[PDB]
Nucleic acid binder design. Structure first.
Lengths: 74, 82, 79, 83, 86, 97, 74
RNA sequence: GCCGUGACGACUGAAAAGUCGGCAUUGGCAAUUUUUGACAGUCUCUAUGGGUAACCUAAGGAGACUGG
């Protein structure tokens, strides 16, 4: 207990992140903690309009992470 | 102090419970546990915007409770003693 | 590997202006300079602003402590 | 550790269906299931709330944001009939 | 005291109500601390729980099968029918 | 712990139980419960007496054409238990007076 | 400032005029009497601002921690 | 109900420490994956429903928006 999420496999891979609020971003996994809070580099916001905007390196709180999908092969 | 202990004493009382989802539950308490999970018998349960349904038994996850309406008769000062 | 908490510690040290995505509220986001933070990701922000994405309007706040409950996402802004 | 959790770990390597808190439906092979219900899957078919389908190679869903899972019936027989 | 209130209904057919308002009916085979539930031969209903609705009893019924439901999303449970013997 | 109930924000509840004074509880259900605190705990579960519950409603399109006017409502509840998560705000006042 | 944390900030703000925004968009202005470990909050001479406009003058008030979005000194 | 803690004991380890059984209670269980809530509220669409037409209705099913 106080377990890690099993995410080493996904380290330094490009990912597609579905967040709550119908929000979606894409970026490279740079790290994580036991709460599933993530560090995502070269992150891009995929606006509901279809337009995408570069936001750089960011922190996503694991709380609000619905789902992730790898855009690479692990 | 721990008020769930108080609720655990209310076996065989009849109560009305209002749920977080608006549902109204009237029945006789068979058991409250430490998580406030509540079990009843002879239950008339009215989901918001339905006519009641009667169930011989119903088991509620504690967190889904808004509040209990207790018997007017209930001797609270007795029950609050430990 | 970069740990998320450390990124924040970096934000703190840098005094980079930060934009926070809130939980289940898209029309408003919060901005400010992280002065300090705690184990619950509660943040102390300086010269903070409410940002209305719909109205293009900003509300001026000053000294803010934002509960971490609301944090969806943490980003940096050049401004 | 919970009885249902042991049965979930038993389904690792099997095809399972997962519905999220938002009602998206993911069907494919369960690679890894963590204690907190965090789920790694592969070769997915996803069916959105509008009905449309898509295909994904690799996914990972947080346990909290799962509403439920459907497991094979291959599991129903044993050994957990003791409880 | 007894802990039995769940263990009593084990092996029975059970009507479980979800937080969105769905109705899951299956054979109650296991539970835990969180009230994560194991439901064998489980179907989902949406429109009604029949009390002999003269028009029909069953609309939007779906066969699911072996279901594990997370307790977070459970609201309540009542006894639907006795255990199947099998 | 008692010290934290006594001097912390929950002293509002501690003070209401000791003085048998009224408090209004703004509640998640959009309802307000007005009454006396017989007991309370960390979570703000409470056992309440002489509760006046107040809320507001609409006829909700009684016409059939989306026409209604807001309506206040109330009801008396002598004895009841409130699960504390539903608490938004708890108000102490010159209410009891 | 050299690291100014949540807890001390709030403690410095006790004895002061504050306004708290709640997640639900209500706002409450008053003197912060105290806060506790869970970040429950006690105001005196509270006022309510809804839609940013003075609604009700309320007096002494407890706010449950989970409701709080943010607190501002003012 | 869940998990700690203190000794006693047993079994391993080079060590640091690790594992197991029974006993005991001076301990806790609202801060991201479950049980002390992010929920609350609004509006449009649909007859497999009724109606003589005109049309009225929306349980169920679908979508949009607010929380300044």
């Amino acid at each position: 207990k106080a377990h890690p999420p099993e995410l080493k496999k996904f380290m330094d891979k490009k990912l597609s992140l579905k967040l709550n609020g119908g929000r979606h971003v894409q970026g490279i996994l740079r790290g994580f903690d036991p709460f599933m809070n993530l560090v995502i580099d070269e992150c891009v916001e995929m606006a509901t309009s279809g337009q995408q905007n570069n936001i750089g390196m960011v922190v996503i709180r694991g709380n609000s992470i619905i789902m992730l999908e790898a855009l690479e092969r692990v | 102090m721990k008020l769930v202990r108080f609720l655990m004493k209310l076996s065989h009382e009849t109560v009305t419970i209002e749920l977080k989802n608006g549902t109204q539950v009237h029945g006789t308490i068979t058991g409250v546990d430490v998580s406030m999970n509540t079990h009843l018998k002879a239950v008339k349960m009215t989901l918001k915007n339905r006519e009641p349904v009667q169930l011989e038994t119903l088991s509620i996850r504690g967190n889904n409770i808004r509040y209990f309406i207790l018997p007017d008769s209930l001797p609270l000062d007795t029950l609050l003693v430990d | 590997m970069v740990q998320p908490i450390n990124l924040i510690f970096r934000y703190l040290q840098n005094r980079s202006r930060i934009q926070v995505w809130l939980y289940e509220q898209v029309n408003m986001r919060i901005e400010g300079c992280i002065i300090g933070f705690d184990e619950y990701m509660n943040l102390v922000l300086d010269d903070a602003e409410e940002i209305h994405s719909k109205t293009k309007s900003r509300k001026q706040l000053g000294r803010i402590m934002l509960k971490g409950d609301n944090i969806t996402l943490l980003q940096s802004v050049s401004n | 550790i919970g009885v249902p959790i042991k049965v979930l770990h038993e389904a690792e390597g099997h095809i399972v269906t997962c519905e999220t808190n938002t009602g998206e439906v993911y069907r494919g092979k369960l690679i890894e299931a963590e204690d907190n219900m965090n789920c790694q899957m592969s070769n997915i078919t996803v069916t959105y709330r509008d009905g449309r389908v898509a295909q994904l190679e690799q996914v990972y869903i947080r346990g909290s944001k799962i509403r439920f899972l459907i497991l094979p019936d291959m599991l129903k027989n044993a050994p957990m009939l003791k409880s | 005291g007894k802990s039995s209130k769940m263990l009593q209904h084990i092996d029975y057919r059970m009507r479980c109500i979800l937080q969105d308002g769905r109705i899951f009916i299956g054979t109650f085979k296991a539970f835990d601390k969180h009230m994560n539930l194991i439901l064998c031969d489980c179907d989902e209903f949406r429109k009604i729980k029949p009390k002999n609705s003269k028009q029909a009893e069953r609309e939007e019924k779906r066969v699911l099968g072996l279901v594990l439901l997370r307790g977070e999303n459970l609201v309540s449970m009542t006894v639907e029918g006795p255990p199947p013997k099998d | 712990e008692e010290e934290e109930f006594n001097t912390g924000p929950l002293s509002v509840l501690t003070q209401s139980v000791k003085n048998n004074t009224q408090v209004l509880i703004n509640c998640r259900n959009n309802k307000k419960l007005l009454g006396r605190v017989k007991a309370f705990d960390r979570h703000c579960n409470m056992v309440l007496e002489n509760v006046k519950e107040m809320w507001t409603e609409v006829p909700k399109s009684g016409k059939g054409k989306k026409k209604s006017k807001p309506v206040n409502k109330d009801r008396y509840i002598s004895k009841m238990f409130l699960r504390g998560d539903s608490v938004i705000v708890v108000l102490r006042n010159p209410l009891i007076a | 400032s050299l690291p100014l944390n949540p807890k001390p900030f709030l403690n410095g703000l006790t004895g002061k005029p504050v306004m708290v925004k709640l997640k639900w968009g209500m706002e409450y202005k008053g003197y912060l009497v105290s806060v506790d470990g869970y970040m429950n909050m006690q105001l005196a001479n509270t006022e309510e601002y809804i839609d940013g406009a003075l609604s009700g003058h309320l007096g002494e008030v407890l706010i449950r921690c989970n409701n709080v979005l943010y607190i501002r000194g003012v």
